[PDB]
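The freezer alarm interrupted the setup, so I double-checked each line after restarting. Inputs confirmed:
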Amino acid sequence: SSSERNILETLLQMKKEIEEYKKSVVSLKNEEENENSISQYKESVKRLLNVT
Amino acid sequence: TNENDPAKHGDQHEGQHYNISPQDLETVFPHGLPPRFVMQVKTFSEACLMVRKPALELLHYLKNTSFAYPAIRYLLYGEKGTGKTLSLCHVIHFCAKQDWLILHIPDAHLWVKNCRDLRFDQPLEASTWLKNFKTTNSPLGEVVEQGITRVRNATDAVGIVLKELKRQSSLGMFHLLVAVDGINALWGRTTLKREDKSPIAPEELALVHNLRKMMKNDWHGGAIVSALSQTGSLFKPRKAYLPQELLGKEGFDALDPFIPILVSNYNPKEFESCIQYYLENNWLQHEKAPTEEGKKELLFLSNANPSLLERHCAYL
Amino acid sequence: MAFSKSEGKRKTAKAEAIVYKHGSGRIKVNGIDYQLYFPITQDREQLMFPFHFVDRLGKHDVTCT
Amino acid sequence: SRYSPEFKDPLIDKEYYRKEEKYVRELKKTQLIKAAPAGKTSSVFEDPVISKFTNMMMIGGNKVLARSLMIQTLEAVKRKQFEKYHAASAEEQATIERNPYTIFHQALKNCEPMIGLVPILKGGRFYQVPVPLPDRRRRFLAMKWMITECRDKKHQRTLMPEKLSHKLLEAFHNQGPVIKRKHDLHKMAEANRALAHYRWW
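Predicted 3D structure, all chains:
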């Protein structure tokens, strides 16, 4: 579902970083969730915008 | 302690408790939170909330996201406490003070409650939401009453009424700032059970499916937030706030990607300030108040919490 | 700040506590605080009795198992 | 004998130790010590009266639930007081009292039977012997009467906390079932102005 994931990401952005989000999604798919995946998700979300 | 300006806006003051609409409460959320909040307001008269850290984050996210941005899920995941509904209540109060369209809703768990016996439909949550909208404050009322009363072939009926409410394009239902308490028990494994083997999957239901679709980039207005609370969790373990593990893979994929930072709890300084205020007001009743033992017991057992402070105040 | 490691037993029970030295903050229990682990008031009093006697309320962290 | 003759209970008193005595302290030290219990936790919230009340209200060995229900009933009484004072009406602190110590004192005063009844026969017929009792036995009988009255369990509609709160509010104003039982006991004792000499102890 990387296609729809990136679509929703671009929507949140408007309505570098996309590659990082895709890699984070891949890591999520690679092995079940733990903590590093959530950390990468938080990182990508922070890189999207800039207001903490 | 108390806010120095009932008028709401870009509110800050991280700690001191604000004051919700006293007599004008009917125009904010007269029907939503359980009777716990009613008892709290009755025993404290004023209030015991505050501009929490999650509330500050929500306000900051809503500041630079006016009606241009339709909806951006500000999923605030944290620890057990940290407040997961008082922030939404404060946001609704601020929106009401700013003359913005607001319509409080009860909860998601209260909507998708368990049932003894049971493309189908359900009258429970639909009728609840419609009654809440009616009691909050053209063919609109006609179709509302129709959806409230008729619940026969309710699949297409609720679909059409939802599409109409989203296509009204006018005052009312323009930007719904829902105050859900537990939007997690929906995408993962729905509480609705199946009489046969294999429980219902998130991609099978109808009414809740359309209710979620209403939040899928619909009604282009002001930004909102869906809190994945846990105080009223159902059929889930404690501390339910994870992204995918809480809603599976596809369940979270269907959601929007956005999670900021973990939230913290109360502030000890303002908590002690409010404790001293209450002491000066004479309310603890317990004769062991005028002494360091009482303050120590408070700082220990309470640990800056609302329910524990209320219990300490209403001991005897 | 020396940190000790003790253990407690009571009617076929076991519990190892790791209380640190001076350090006002919170009494944790494997990430969970005492407030989130003892919903009862008498349990709170039992857990506080050491600090209640020593008079040092909030000055040591713990990670008891 | 489940208790070992070696191990012995401790002494939880500590407020006095804040300033012959040294010898007593050394003796207490030289004693096979034991651990303290959880039910009868002699902490700051260990009120002997309320402790005994909860112990008697204990069902199936659930002293935790008993204490929780007692605290909840006290909170409900204080909430009714607030409704009569703060919650509903305006704060009228001049004609309302929120201190349960007055209720406890009124109970200790007008809920104590000062005359016991023991069926002591002499030959082959039971005779009521009004025998005096000390303060401990009188207080114990008062507590037992209060608790067994609060635990009616026969109305088949009232709940435990509601029952307790209603009975306490009824007995507060120098009435209720406990004071009526005390009056009946006093009348029965008065009815035996001569049969008070058939006591073996």
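Quick read of the result. Residues 2 and 22 of chain A are 7 Å apart (CA to CA).
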